[PDB]
Amino acid sequence: ELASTSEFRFDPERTPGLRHAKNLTDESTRELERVLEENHSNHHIFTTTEDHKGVYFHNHIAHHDITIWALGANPSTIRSQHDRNSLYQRQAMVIQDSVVKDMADPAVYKRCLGREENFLNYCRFFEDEINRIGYQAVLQKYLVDGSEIADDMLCRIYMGYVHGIIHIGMALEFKQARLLAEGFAQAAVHHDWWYTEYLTQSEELARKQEEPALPLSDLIDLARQDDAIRNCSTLYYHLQKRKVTGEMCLDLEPARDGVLKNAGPELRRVAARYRVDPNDLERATAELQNAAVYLTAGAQRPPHICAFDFFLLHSVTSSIGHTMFLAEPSLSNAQKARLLEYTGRVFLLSYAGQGSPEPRLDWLASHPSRLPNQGWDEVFDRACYHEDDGHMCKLIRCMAHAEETSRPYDHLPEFRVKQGLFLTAGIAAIDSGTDKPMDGTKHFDFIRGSGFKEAWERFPLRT
Numbered sequence: 371e372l373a374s375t376s377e378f379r380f381d382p383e384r385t386p387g388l389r390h391a392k393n394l395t396d397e398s399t400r401e402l403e404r405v406l407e408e409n410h411s412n413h414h415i416f417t418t419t420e421d422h423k424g425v426y427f428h429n430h431i432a433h434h435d436i437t438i439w440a441l442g443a444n445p446s447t448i449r450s451q452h453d454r455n456s457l458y459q460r461q462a463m464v465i466q467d468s469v470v471k472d473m474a475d476p477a478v479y480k481r482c483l484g485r486e487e488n489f490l491n492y493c494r495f496f497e498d499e500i501n502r503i504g505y506q507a508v509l510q511k512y513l514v515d516g517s518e519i520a521d522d523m524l525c526r527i528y529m530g531y532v533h534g535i536i537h538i539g540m541a542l543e544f545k546q547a548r549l550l551a552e553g554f555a556q557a558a559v560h561h562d563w564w565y566t567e568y569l570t571q572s573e574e575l576a577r578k579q580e581e582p583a584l585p586l587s588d589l590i591d592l593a594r595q596d597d598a599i600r601n602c603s604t605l606y607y608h609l610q611k612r613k614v615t616g617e618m619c620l621d622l623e624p625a626r627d628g629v630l631k632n633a634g635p636e637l638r639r640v641a642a643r644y645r646v647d648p649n650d651l652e653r654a655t656a657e658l659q660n661a662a663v664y665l666t667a668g669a670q671r672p673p674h675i676c677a678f679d680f681f682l683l684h685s686v687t688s689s690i691g692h693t694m695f696l697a698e699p700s701l702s703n704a705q706k707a708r709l710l711e712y713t714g715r716v717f718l719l720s721y722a723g724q725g726s727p728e729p730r731l732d733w734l735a736s737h738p739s740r741l742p743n744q745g746w747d748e749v750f751d752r753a754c755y756h757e758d759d760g761h762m763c764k765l766i767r768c769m770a771h772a773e774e775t776s777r778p779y780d781h782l783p784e785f786r787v788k789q790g791l792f793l794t795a796g797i798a799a800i801d802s803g804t805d806k807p808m809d810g811t812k813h814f815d816f817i818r819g820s821g822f823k824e825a826w827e828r829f830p831l832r833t
């Protein structure tokens with residue numbers, strides 16, 4: 371199954387992922403293995419120091435390179451995209467082999483957590499663990515077996531806007547033990563303590579079963595009806611400037627400083643109702659994936675062009691990984707259910723942070739295609755040439771996957787996004803794209819604070 375911990379090895383037929391272009395070339399695949407190893411060896415998992423912008427910005431190079439290979443990028447496009455995103459990277463941390471070995475003492479493992487200088491140390495520790503006990507046993511030991519170490523790591527994969535679970539999802543999907551170690555290592559060095567508190571306190575509350583279980587889509591809607599949740603945040607988190615230089619920062623963080631400060635008990639009471647049925651996982655997985663497209667693609671405002679929220683779209687891109695968790699024999703139905711629950715509860719926290727935008731699927735559905743005769747194949751190809759850090763192509767590929775996992779359940783009311791709206795949402799995403807989507811690490815094509823009317827002021831009106 372999983373390629374070597376020591377090397378990246380992709381094949382257009384053996385490792386094409388759950389959703390992809392037609393006719394992936396060996397040439398693109400070799401170029402991809404080249405740039406991935408350059409990225410692993412030369413670039414740190416964070417592209418900023420924490421104090422620079424106030425929160426860590428993440429290295430998306432692994433995710434972008436893989437995604438645009440999967441969508442049929444030529445070797446030249448892979449190189450060009452990778453080279454441009456390489457320019458703002460931090461230099462990789464040093465590996466100390468004595469620390470890698472000492473991390474087998476749980477006291478030492480625990481002492482190294484939350485420290486970015488340990489990123490390649492943890493990568494090697496996880497590569498070693500995979501080779502020692504195999505990946506399936508790593509998932510038990512470091513995620514689902516309910517040890518203090520596995521419960522700690524289960525919260526970390528969601529820290530830093532769920533980049534750990536995104537990385538782990540991609541590793542299982544593309545069958546790379548080397549990317550899986552990267553994933554556990556990314557999670558290990560995060561230190562967003564409020565995720566541990568929210569997910570731990572929410573699981574404890576859910577155990578009491580005080581109110582009935584709802585689909586994620588119903589809980590997105592329930593959050594909006596709540597006075598404390600709908601008012602707990604502000605657009606000000608996306609407009610903060612440093613007093614001295616006027617530079618952008620996230621010194622205040624919507625989740626820590628807004629959602630959990632102002633509406634903690636109210637949100638935990640909603641989160642406690644996302645309880646997933648172990649006997650119904652194919653539908654329950656597809657429903658979480660639909661619900662991510664609902665809250666994200668739904669977050670539109672007439673009379674503006676369709677635009678996608680930078681923070682909400684990590685719900686869609688994180689969501690794909692549960693298709694791999696579902697397909698994994700070594701995980702119990704109960705472990706698979708718990709993973710889904712954690713992901714869903716984070717989706718609610720993220721949604722509240724962005725002002726809980728009321729879905730306007732009517733406005734999304736009437737999106738006028740900039741170009742004629744666009745199907746997924748045409749959208750995928752345009753996503754290859756979109757010059758960001760990979761958010762746009764991951765959003766599009768993950769929505770195309772949700773369309774497929776939803777098709778069997780298109781008649782059920784808890785599936786708010788119906789089959790035709792997925793391609794419309796894909797066209798609306800690529801159509802919102804411009805000729806200069808980024809400047810270094812700054813994004814311009816995504817909205818920030820879609821739930822706040824003022825966020826939409828710099829977005830053109832639909833013609």
Ligand SMILES: Cc1cc(O)c(C)c(C)c1O
Pocket residue numbers: 425426427428429530531811812813
């Ligand atoms: C560009 C960019 C990358 C990131 O990973 C995160 C987390 C933020 C807030 C950003 O603005």
Ligand SMILES: [Fe+3]
Pocket residue numbers: 428430533684761
């Ligand atoms: Fe991201």
